[PDB]
Structure formats: structure tokens, C-alpha cells
Amino acid sequence: RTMRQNLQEASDVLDDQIESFTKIIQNHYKLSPNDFADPTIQSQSEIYAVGRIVPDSPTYDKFLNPESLSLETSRMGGVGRRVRLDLSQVNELSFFLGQIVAFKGKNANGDYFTVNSILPLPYPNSPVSTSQELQEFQANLEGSSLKVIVTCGPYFANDNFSLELLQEFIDSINNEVKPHVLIMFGPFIDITHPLIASGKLPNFPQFKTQPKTLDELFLKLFTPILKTISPHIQTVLIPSTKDAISNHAAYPQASLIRKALQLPKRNFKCMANPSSFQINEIYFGCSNVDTFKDLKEVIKGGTTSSRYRLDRVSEHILQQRRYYPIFPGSIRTHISGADLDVSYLGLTEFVGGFSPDIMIIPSELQHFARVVQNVVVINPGRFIRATGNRGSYAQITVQCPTLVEGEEPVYLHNVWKRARVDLIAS
Amino acid sequence: GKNMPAVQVALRMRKAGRVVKAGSVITFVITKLSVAERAHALNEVMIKSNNLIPDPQYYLEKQIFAPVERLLERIDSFNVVRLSEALGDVERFKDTVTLELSCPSCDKRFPFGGIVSSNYYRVSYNGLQCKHCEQLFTPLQLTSQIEHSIRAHISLYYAGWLQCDDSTCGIVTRQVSVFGKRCLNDGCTGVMRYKYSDKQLYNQLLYFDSLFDCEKNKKQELKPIYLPDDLDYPQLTESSIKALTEQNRELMETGRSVVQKYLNDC
Secondary structure, eight states: OOSOOOHHHHHHHHHHHHHHHHHHHHHHTTOOGGGBOOSSSOOSSOEEEEEEEEESSSSOOSSOOTTSEEEEOOHHHHTTOOEEEEOSSOSOEEEOTTOEEEEEEEOSSSSEEEEEEEEOOOOOOOOEEOHHHHHHHHHHHTTSOEEEEEEOSOOSOSSOOOOHHHHHHHHHIIIIIOOSEEEEESOSSBSSOHHHHTTOOOOOTTOSSOOSSHHHHHHHHHHHHHTTSOTTSEEEEEOOTTBSSOSOOSBSBOOOOHHHHTOOTTTEEEOOBSEEEEETTEEEEEOOSOHHHHOOOEEESHHHHHSOHHHHHHHHHHHHTBSOOOSSOOEEOOOEEOOBOGGGGGGGBOGGGOOOSEEEOOOSSOOEEEEETTEEEEEOOOSBOSSSOBOOEEEEEEOOOOEEOSSSOEEEOOHHHHEEEEEEOO | OOSOHHHHHHHHHHHHTOOOOTTOOOOEEEBOOOTTTTEEEHHHHHSGGGOOOBOHHHHIIIIIIHHHHHHTTTSTTOOHHHHHHTTOOTTTTTTOOOOEEEOTTTOOEEEOOSSSOOSSEEEETTEEEETTTOOBOOHHHHHHHHHHHHHHHHHHHHTOOEEESOTTTOOEEOOOOSSTTBOSSTTOOOBEEOSSOHHHHHHHHHHHHHHTOHHHHHHTOOOOSSOTTOTTOOOOOHHHHHHHHHHTHHHHHHHHHHHHHHHTTO
16 A cells, blocks of 8 residues: 555545444444434434534634534435534533444534434444364463563663663563563654654664664664564564654554564564454454543543543443544644554454454553453553653463354353453563 | 767767867768768778768768859859759755754754755765764764654654635645535535645655755756755855765665655655
8 A cells, every 4th residue: 555645535434434333323223224314404303313523613622522512424314514513411421533423312403413312332242262262272272371461662761772671571571471472562663762853873882883774773773682582472563653664654554574674483473553363262452552642532421520531432442443533633743643544444443343352552641451341451551661761561361261142152252351461560 | 069970979989988189180971860970980980891881962962062052153054953963857846845954963953955065064075064063974863864854744744634725715624524525614615635745745755865866966956955045055066066976875875765765655
């Protein structure tokens, strides 16, 4: 995929999301198309309406309130006409940009669609596995538990380029923890890094021949260090929206090319940002854009506020079936941002509609370990802080392996029962 | 000199090895295509093994007919018909915004214009030099800054601003309707367009590539980064420019590869 942004294809994808979630609503709630209509027009009867949430003004303030939120229709639903929302009737709501919500209500006057009730989006199915595959995973783990170690970038401080903490971590995972899988998200060498931003980059006497680009800076700086991870530790690589090594500067992001990064084939793999994969039976979901920090909600009602914010945002991620339900995307006015590739917005949508067993989404917030709606949300925090002090990383202790009714016996995965997620400092 | 056979012959002689200097007498004979290209040196034609025969047409016309016509012009019973029977890139970068660079030592910021004059940098034999502090740039202190600017620009690009065509309203936004081209203002017929459209990014990236183009630097086609009235206006000579480009070929090539990292994917 070239670096091209087309307005019409993006519009197509956004229409598609509304259409698909409208069908999902109509299926899980067993509703007929005739009960859905156009919410932007005057109607004397209640209807079902499904759409996205957008500000009532395309030039809108930073902050939003429940009296200034609007609903946009699909192409065939309301001819793409945005209708304002009257949320005064509903006491409890959790709305934000880019989501999709299903409203019961009515358009009394024409310029407002009153929300009578909210149809909560059904939580996606959890994945299953057969008995034989689970037994094979049992044999793979040999009765022992599974250890997956999870880390995020950046890995050196703002003012120095010492990787002693990373070396200590690698020694630890090689000698004591002995993990089956190690995870490292990008960026490794950030490009919002202040020194590389201001060019204050000094000679490295620990290189015989000085590098010339950030690619060779990686090759002489990080490839030595990464080559010390034990071969028995299968390690994945994940890029980010700021990694200077990658020739992809957008989200969704393609993988790195392992050859040019010069890592041995024995224990390293390059995966995509985002991506999903299976370690034995556990169905992982990885994403490296800070939804938690940037996703800003508009909350009415005491109960929704009373809950933890992280749980609310994780349940919103589950409902939207995509790792980054924020649209429009984030901006750091301009230095960096989310960098959403909207025409490829489908690539971040959940793999096949399956919510993963574990979903790890690095955030610049504090580290935490939380389970919501029976999915393991993990934020292992940044490995090294801006000052350069210690950070944290995730250690997952899953016990070696519910039955689903059906002619074909399958088993819903229950990781939150079996996994122990420990947030140990770097 | 391109339609004079003489200049053509002298340049061919210089390419072949024959030394011709100003004030030379060159003797040339046409062989058998224009008048100039057919020409060659007389000694070159003389060697009979080269199969360089004189052109009958050109000689019979020019060395005979025209002089004979002039000589017999005003003599009774002369006919010309009897005599004839017996013989026979500046526009592409108009909107680009300059690549700003910084000093590793003195933190000074300055625009860059290839190997040309500058009150802020001096292209030395050993590389680029910050005149305010005379410190030399290492390859990283240059390329990392360049690609920092590159990634900031691509961040601005995928920020995906939108523009209303209709001049009277002209909203700028990032909200995208499912009918992308239709404006979001009530009844506005202005057609929505990205402000930082892909074409401009490609123009910026080729402008970057020109900034490190050894040939364009030798040929000196590079866009001037300072207007005449700028108080920061810098004149280096083309010979110095060529020498500095040849000495700094490797740095130009590494800087080129850094930009090609995002060019070949553009």
C-alpha cells in the first residue's frame, strides 16, 4: 500500500462500518429493517436509528457536552444527513468520537433526534478451541504453565542512550523467568525523541565505524543487544506510529522487514500494528496506540462516572470491535499523533469478530492489570521513563489448559480464570 | 556553435584527444544527418581506410553553384536553370516549505539550499559547517534531523485536514462525511478536499531529493531559498560548487538514501 489518502474511499469505509453494525444490531436484537428509518427527518412515530457520533459543528471546540452532540447517518439510512441529539431524557451515557451507538427515540421537531433509550452494543463472541487442540497445547506446555513477557518502548532516556536497564531485563528473562514468548512494541528509537529532533547526537565510541542513519544506528545499537535474547525465547517485534526504522508512518501500520533489521531467524518475528495471534490456545490482540490517554468521553449520570475510566474505555473498545474507536484521530499540535489510515480502517477491526483473550494496549498512562467483560486488558507501561528511571513490564502466568453446547464440541477460552498478570518493574 | 560544422569538429577533436585552443585554424571536410554532424577533420578524412568520402551533394551545391551563380549573376545569356541542370521543475516546487536544520552545538536554526551561498552554513571540503560556530556535522546529526522533518510532514499529511472549495465559507476540518466530497455546512455546494493532498507531499519529497541531487547541484537549478529582500540573504562560484559536490558525494548519497526511504514508498 502506497502513501495515498483518498477522501471517497474513506467515506466508503465509514459508510460500511455503519451498515455492518446496523446489521449486527438488527441480528442480535432480531429487528426488521422497516423498524429502522431516517432519524434526521421529522417523524410522528418512534424509529430505530444507528449512526456515528460527531460534533454539531465541523469547526468545534476541544471540549464537548451532552447538549452539543450529533448523529450522522449512513448513505442509505439518512442520506448522510447529520442530526443533532437531545440527551436530556437519558440520564446515563458514555459517548465519544468515532463510536457507533443505537438509539431508540423520535424526531419531534426536525432539527433534533431525541434519545429515548440506548441499545447497548453486544459484546463480541469469545473464541473457542476443540478438545484435541487443547490437549496438544497441554503436551506443548508439558504440564508447566505458560510465561509471556510484555514490554513497550521507548527503551532509553530523553538525554542519554544507555541501555543498561534493557540489558538487565534481557539477562533476567534469559536466566530466571525463562519465558516462552517475549513481546516488544515500538517505537525503539523514537523520532519525537528530543535529541534526535534537535540533532544533538554525539559520536558512539562503542561503534568501530560510526553509523550514518537511524537504520544503522539501530543496527549497531540495538541489534547487538537484541541478539542476546535466548533462542528458546520466541520474540515478536511490533512497530508504532513513531518508529523511525519503519518506512510506514501511519496507523494501521505494516510490519518491519526482519532481514534489513538483521535479526536471526531462530527466535524473532515481525508482526503488524495492530495484529492478533495465538500462543498455544490464548488468543492475543496487540495494539500500540494510546486510546486510554486520548479517548475523551462525555459522561452523564452518576453510575457511569463512578466506574473506573479504564473499564469504561475497555468496554467501549470491545463494543466498537476495533482497537482505536477514536475518529477523528489524535493530534499533538504538529509533532506526532495517531495517524489513522482511514481507507484501511478495516485492518484494525477485530479479527473475524472475535474479541481476543488478551488485549495489550500500551498507554503513556500508569500501568495496570484489569479484567472487563472477561477479556484481559493489559498496560505494561513504558519500560523506561522520560527521566530514565525504572518503568514496568508485564509477566503473564497462564495455567496449562467451559464447554459450548453443539454437535461439534468446542470450548470457550477462560484466560481471566487461569492467567496471573504481574506488573514487575523493569 | 551547434549549427556550425567548425565548432562540432573542434569539440569532437577535443573528445577524441586533439587539443584545440582559441585562435586555432581547423581544417574540415564534409563526409556522407545535418551539415554540421557530417563534418570531420581533414586529416581524419585523409586516411583512406575510414571510408569517409566527400558528400557530392553538399560540395556540388555550396562550393560551386552559389559562387558560380554570384559570379555569372549579371552577365548576358546566363541562366540559373542551365546551371542547376548541369549540377543538380521550477513550477513543481513553488509551494514546498523549506527543510529547517539545527546546529548540534549552538542550537541555531537555518534553512538549507544545497551547495550554494549562505550566511548560516558553509559547505566545506570535509562536509557542512555551521558558520556561527564552525563545528562540523556528522552524518547522523544531519540525516536524523532531515527525517524528523520528513515524519513531521507525513504526520501533518495523515492528519487529513479537509477544505471547503466554496470561497465564501472555506471551512477547515477533519470530519469526513460518508459522501466525502460534499461539504458539511448546511447546503454548502463547496467540494471538500484535503488541504495537504498527496501531490504536495510528493512535491515536498522530490524537493528534498533535489536538495541532495549531485547533478542538480552541479547544474545549479536548485530553487533559491532566499528572496532578494531577505535580511538573511547570503556568491559561490560554479567551480567551487563542483569541487565541493565531488568531495561531498558520499554525504549527498547518504542523505539521498535517507529521503529515498520514504520516496520509493510515496
